Amino acid sequence: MMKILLIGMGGTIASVKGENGYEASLSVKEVLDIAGIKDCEDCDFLDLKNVDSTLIQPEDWVDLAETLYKNVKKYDGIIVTHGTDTLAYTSSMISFMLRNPPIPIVFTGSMIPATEENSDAPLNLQTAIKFATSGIRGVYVAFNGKVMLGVRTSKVRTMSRDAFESINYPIIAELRGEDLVVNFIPKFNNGEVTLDLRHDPKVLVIKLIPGLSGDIFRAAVELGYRGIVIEGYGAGGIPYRGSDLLQTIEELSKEIPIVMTTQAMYDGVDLTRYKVGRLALRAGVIPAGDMTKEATVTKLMWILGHTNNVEEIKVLMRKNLVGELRD
Amino acid sequence: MMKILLIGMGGTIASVKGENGYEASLSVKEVLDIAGIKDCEDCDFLDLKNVDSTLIQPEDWVDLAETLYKNVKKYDGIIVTHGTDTLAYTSSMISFMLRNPPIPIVFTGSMIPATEENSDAPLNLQTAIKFATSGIRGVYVAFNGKVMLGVRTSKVRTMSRDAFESINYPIIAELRGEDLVVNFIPKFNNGEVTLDLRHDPKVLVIKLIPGLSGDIFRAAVELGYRGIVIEGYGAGGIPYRGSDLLQTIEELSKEIPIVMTTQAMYDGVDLTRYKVGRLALRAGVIPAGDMTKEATVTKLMWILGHTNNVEEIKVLMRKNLVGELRD
Ligand SMILES: CC1=N[C@H](C(=O)O)CCN1
Numbered sequence: 001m002m003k004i005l006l007i008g009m010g011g012t013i014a015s016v017k018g019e020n021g022y023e024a025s026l027s028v029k030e031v032l033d034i035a036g037i038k039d040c041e042d043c044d045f046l047d048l049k050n051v052d053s054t055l056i057q058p059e060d061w062v063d064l065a066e067t068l069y070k071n072v073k074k075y076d077g078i079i080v081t082h083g084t085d086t087l088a089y090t091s092s093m094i095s096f097m098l099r100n101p102p103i104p105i106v107f108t109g110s111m112i113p114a115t116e117e118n119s120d121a122p123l124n125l126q127t128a129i130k131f132a133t134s135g136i137r138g139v140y141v142a143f144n145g146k147v148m149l150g151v152r153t154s155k156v157r158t159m160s161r162d163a164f165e166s167i168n169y170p171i172i173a174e175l176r177g178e179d180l181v182v183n184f185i186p187k188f189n190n191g192e193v194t195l196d197l198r199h200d201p202k203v204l205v206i207k208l209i210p211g212l213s214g215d216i217f218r219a220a221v222e223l224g225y226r227g228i229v230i231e232g233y234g235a236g237g238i239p240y241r242g243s244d245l246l247q248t249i250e251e252l253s254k255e256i257p258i259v260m261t262t263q264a265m266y267d268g269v270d271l272t273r274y275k276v277g278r279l280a281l282r283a284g285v286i287p288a289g290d291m292t293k294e295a296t297v298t299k300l301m302w303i304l305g306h307t308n309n310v311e312e313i314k315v316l317m318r319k320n321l322v323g324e325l326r327d
Numbered sequence: 328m329m330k331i332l333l334i335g336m337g338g339t340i341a342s343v344k345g346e347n348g349y350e351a352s353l354s355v356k357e358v359l360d361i362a363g364i365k366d367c368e369d370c371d372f373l374d375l376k377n378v379d380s381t382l383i384q385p386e387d388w389v390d391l392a393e394t395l396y397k398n399v400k401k402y403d404g405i406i407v408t409h410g411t412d413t414l415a416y417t418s419s420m421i422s423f424m425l426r427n428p429p430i431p432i433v434f435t436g437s438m439i440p441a442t443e444e445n446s447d448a449p450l451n452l453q454t455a456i457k458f459a460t461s462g463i464r465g466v467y468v469a470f471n472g473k474v475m476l477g478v479r480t481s482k483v484r485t486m487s488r489d490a491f492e493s494i495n496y497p498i499i500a501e502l503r504g505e506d507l508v509v510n511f512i513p514k515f516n517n518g519e520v521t522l523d524l525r526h527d528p529k530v531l532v533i534k535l536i537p538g539l540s541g542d543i544f545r546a547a548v549e550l551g552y553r554g555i556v557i558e559g560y561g562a563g564g565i566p567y568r569g570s571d572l573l574q575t576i577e578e579l580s581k582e583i584p585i586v587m588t589t590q591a592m593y594d595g596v597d598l599t600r601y602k603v604g605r606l607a608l609r610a611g612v613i614p615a616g617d618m619t620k621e622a623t624v625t626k627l628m629w630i631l632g633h634t635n636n637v638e639e640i641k642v643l644m645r646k647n648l649v650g651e652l653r654d
């Protein structure tokens with residue numbers, strides 16, 4: 001029957017409490033054994049990386065995307081074990097780099113090392129295995145009995161089992177007993193499996209705070225940053241009182257994309273709603289709509305691997321590519 | 328009986344849909360009338376500002392703190408109506424600037440203008456009035472039937488009534504019918520009412536993302552920024568692979584405070600837990616513990632109004648001043 005591949009990237013799930021605190025150490029095969037999984041007769045194992053996900057770089061996304069693409073024909077499902085810190089960035093970026101996969105690609109990990117007795121690893125691996133053999137294609141994240149679309153997933157808690165949520169977007173599937181029950185299936189168009197590794201990682205994310213001036217923005221441009229994301233307040237906007245920020249934005253927004261997302265967790269941005277928003281639009285700011293913060297950052301990096309034309313970048317950022325955005 | 332003062336700062340609650348979308352317009356007295364409030368016989372009214380809270384600057388915090396201090400003896404309670412965008416920054420900063428107030432000081436506002444038929448304004452004003460006459464002293468936020476400690480409050484939703492949550496800290500009070508029921512009373516020491524307006528607003532908040540280099544940090548220092556806050560991933564830490572960031576931090580952390588908070592919403596940071604965290608500590612990074620992002624930023628600004636000595640700043644950031652932090 002079904003053949004699945006497990007790819008190890010590291011993470012708390014594979015970690016041990018060494019000298020300087022937890023660090024990734026175990027292989028993905030060892031992780032499965034320790035977590036007590038046996039329903040894996042026809043399971044292949046590959047260790048791609050073995051790091052605390054805080055260490056993940058954009059080139060690791062390239063390496064992982066390539067590896068996935070080389071293996072989508074050979075397997076019925078692929079599971080990637082990964083640290084939780086940057087799990088959502090990786091699942092978001094891979095969603096852009098590897099479009100219309102013919103199989104489920106499921107990211108998972110744990111908040112508590114698999115070695116530990118109270119570990120969330122066995123549940124998460126079980127959920128991942130159940131989904132990887134479901135026939136439901138796409139890039140997903142399995143965590144705490146939930147399956148979420150990889151490009152709509154964010155880490156919301158640092159010290160809880162329920163660490164990940166689907167942001168502004170319905171759960172794909174959820175455990176009821178041992179029944180993984182479907183809640184919502186994304187509406188894919190199924191084109192040709194497409195690998196597209198092009199990206200530019202040189203982007204800056206600045207949190208809007210009272211009194212912020214435009215000086216660090218023009219410094220970023222001088223440093224050769226190719227894009228800036230600003231987390232505004234609430235539905236989004238730029239203050240015009242108190243700083244040269246709006247004036248600074250008006251000048252820079254035609255040299256580089258300036259993307260507005262929100263500091264809040266849920267509901268995203270809508271710049272048409274307030275005067276501060278519409279001024280931000282007039283200044284050339286690109287809205288990130290209802291995208292997660294991780295999808296916004298990775299999508300911008302990915303697009304910058306294709307074009308530096310701000311107008312075109314605006315069009316692509318506003319276009320729903322893989323389910324990351326409400327069109 | 329009880330005498331309360333209402334101070335208007337603006338916000339959606341006082342807003343109208345003008346030419347470029349919503350902008351603040353109505354006076355705080357008009358807001359009360361439109362919201363349908365009458366149980367306010369002995370209520371004084373003062374309009375301090377009238378702006379979309381996206382426009383709030385640090386000097387407005389000074390003006391508001393001064394006004395509160397001049398009025399804490401005259402009234403039994405004070406209510407401040409305020410935009411939701413920066414409400415939490417203002418309630419956090421005022422908590423540092425105005426210590427041991429002898430009365431309840433309650434911040435509130437609404438997600439939907441008081442003019443609108445389905446407005447959350449009447450409920451929020453009611454809750455604010457009930458708490459302002461409760462005799463429970465301190466700085467608080469009332470929203471969606473909840474009363475939260477002002478220095479533990481963040482905006483988590485941009486388009487929902489339940490916009491604010493108490494982060495890593497128990498609700499103070501909650502509505503059950505018309506009964507405002509107490510859940511938890513903060514353990515104040517009641518010293519002398521202290522006004523302390525000293526702050527330095529020149530701080531930068533950068534979101535950690537894969538591949539981030541230290542170049543923008545040393546640019547910030549050259550720009551004269553007096554502090555940097557970094558939102559790390561999860562429990563916190565600095566990547567040592569892929570960038571000159573950790574090396575950059577080691578150099579800068581003795582010139583200016585570099586504070587680590589988290590990109591996630593709940594549970595805060597703990598740098599002792601992972602190798603990436605302990606390296607961050609060794610590099611001179613100051614942990615923000617379980618503080619909200621708004622408390623972290625305002626507390627740092629406030630402290631920078633007192634000292635530029637990094638060692639001392641570290642001590643103060645790690646000290647629970649007004650309930651913002653678990654000691
Ligand atoms: C490299 C690549 N070539 C084929 C294509 O683009 O159609 C498969 C997916 N991507």
Ligand SMILES: CC1=N[C@H](C(=O)O)CCN1
Binds near residue numbers: 522
């Ligand atoms: C300015 C001021 N003086 C008095 C004091 O510090 O004790 C009251 C609170 N702050």
